[PDB]
Amino acid sequence: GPGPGSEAKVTRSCAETRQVLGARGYSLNLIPPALISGEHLRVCPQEYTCCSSETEQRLIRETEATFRGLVEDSGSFLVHTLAARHRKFDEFFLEMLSVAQHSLTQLFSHSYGRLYAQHALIFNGLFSRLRDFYGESGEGLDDTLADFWAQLLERVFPLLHPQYSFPPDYLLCLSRLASSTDGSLQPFGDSPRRLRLQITRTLVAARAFVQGLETGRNVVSEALKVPVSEGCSQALMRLIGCPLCRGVPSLMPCQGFCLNVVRGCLSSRGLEPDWGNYLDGLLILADKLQGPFSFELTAESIGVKISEGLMYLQENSAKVSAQVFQECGPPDPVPARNRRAPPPREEAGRLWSMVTEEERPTTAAGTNLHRLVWELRERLARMRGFWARLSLTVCGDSRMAADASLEAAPCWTGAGRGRYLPPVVGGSPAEQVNNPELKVDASGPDVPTRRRRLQLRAATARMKTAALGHDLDGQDADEDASGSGGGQQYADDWMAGAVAPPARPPRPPYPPRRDGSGGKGGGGSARYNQGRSRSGGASIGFHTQTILILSLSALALLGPR
């Protein structure tokens, strides 16, 4: 194949190797000027060499460091963007929570006057619980939304009818009436039904999205904590450092040889098949938050849904009075007057009024929401192939080292030169079992890969279910249904140690695993500890999150006390 021209030089000259590695800070006395009268090579073929064993080991470490730099920088970007998506999403929610709250204060102070002003804490208290629910700390928002209307009927009604006496029996009656006469649509119309349904189902869809982004952030952050195997460091030495130790720095690796080496180095790709399903859960959910579960629309609509209920309260005041002064007790005599009511009192200070509507935010607020869901949708989708791109990037960079040539021309194949022909395996560790250059047994994926793969699926199920507007009190079904899911299994370490008269610290006979371990003390889900297990106990380390708890058994040795 075609390639660049070369200068005639002494065959396998190690002086040239010294020029290349001396620039990297290698001690010059570790590299002879000509091939050493020994082989000294263990990872590279065992032949005469320019590398002392120290030089060979330095190259293994240097190539491993170069490898890690290309993976970690691309991972730091993904972690950074996941944090950026998270922060940007939360800031508009916090903003609209505050903007709606002020606009409601302006709306109700003028439209309802003292009826609102004396009770503003109740209306603003709701907003604090909208935020607490968003953070999963105030999940009892549904009861807060029910109590909101009970408090209003208890406290606004006596101000509408202040001629009547309201002992606590009537006040408590008014608070109960709201729950029984909302069924008849009298004290607030159907507004309580509108308010309670829209807010809760929108917030769980948004909360699921926040939880998903955090799940991804923590999945990727620990995926980079998967160590580089010693087999990878040796395969990387075969990739780059070996022809240099043979005194030929011009030979650089075939892309197909490289891809197999790098794919074997990346066991973290066990996260990949659930990474796609996890991002699909976010993407479907993101589309739902654009309109029917748009929180920014919901936030403003709170004002209208409450104002409608308070208008029904004033309109149906006579109808509510008919219930209050029969169910709570008889009417109070009052100094009612006939003929004509007095004219209303006016104020010397200019009074103002305003009206809110259930319209989506406009101009900058509307376009920021539109851009938010565009940035969330495109950036998440593009990073779906991240785990595959890790393998392609490292070997694309290695191709460009020899950009003046093609693999049609001879390239380095680990132990020699030519064109690489064996196949390149796919992704996940399952395909790395078939890897011809760096074989990896898929039976033992790394701990972050095992634990975080589970988290991706749990998030997937919740986000797709919440996309329907379903509460997050559902299940981890992959059918978006109420069927049960998750569970997993756990094992523990039983230990025994006499408390008295001997004071022996606890030690296992054996940890009873699913199979009972060597002591055969198990039954699948059952775990048994046998033998001289007096003064026994157990240590349980949960596998889904690092949590460790202890227990003890009342089997103290005691002796002939």
Author numbering: 19 to 579
Q: Which sentences did the original study use to describe this structure?
A:
Glypicans (GPCs) are a family of heparan sulfate (HS) proteoglycans that are bound to the cell surface by a glycosylphosphatidylinositol (GPI) anchor. Certain GPCs, such as GPC3 and GPC2, are oncofetal antigens that are expressed in early development and largely silenced in adult normal tissues but upregulated in epithelial solid tumors. We and others have demonstrated that GPC2 is highly expressed in neuroblastoma (NB), one of the deadliest childhood cancers, and minimally expressed in normal tissues, making it an attractive candidate for CAR T cell therapy. We then identified a monoclonal antibody (mAb), which we called CT3, that recognizes tumor-associated exons 3 and 10 of GPC2.
To validate the binding epitope of CT3 on GPC2, we conducted negative stain electron microscopy (EM) to visualize the structure of the GPC2:CT3 antibody-binding fragment (Fab) complex. The representative EM images in Figure 3B show that CT3 formed a stable and rigid complex with GPC2. To obtain maps with a higher local resolution, we performed particle subtraction, followed by additional classifications and three-dimensional (3D) refinement. The final 3D reconstruction, with a resolution of 21 Å, showed that CT3 interacts with epitopes from both exons 10 and 3 of GPC2. Surprisingly, CT3 strongly bound not only to the C-terminal region (exon 10) that was used for immunization but also to the recombinant exon 3 fragment of GPC2, which helps to explain the reduced reactivity of CT3 in normal tissues. First, we determined CT3′s binding to each peptide by ELISA; however, no obvious reactivity to any linear peptide was found, indicating that CT3 may recognize a conformational epitope in exon 3. CT3 showed an appreciably stronger binding to the mixture of peptides 10–11 and peptides 14–15 than other combinations. We predicted that the residues 148–162 (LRDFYGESGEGLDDT), which are found in peptides 14 and 15, could contain the CT3′s epitope in exon 3 of GPC2 based on the EM structure. Interestingly, the helix that comprises peptides 10–11 is close to peptide 14, suggesting that the binding of CT3 to exon 3 needs the interaction between these 2 regions. Overall, we demonstrate that CT3 binds, at least in part, to a region of GPC2 encoded by exon 3, a unique sequence predominantly expressed in tumors but undetectable in most healthy tissues.
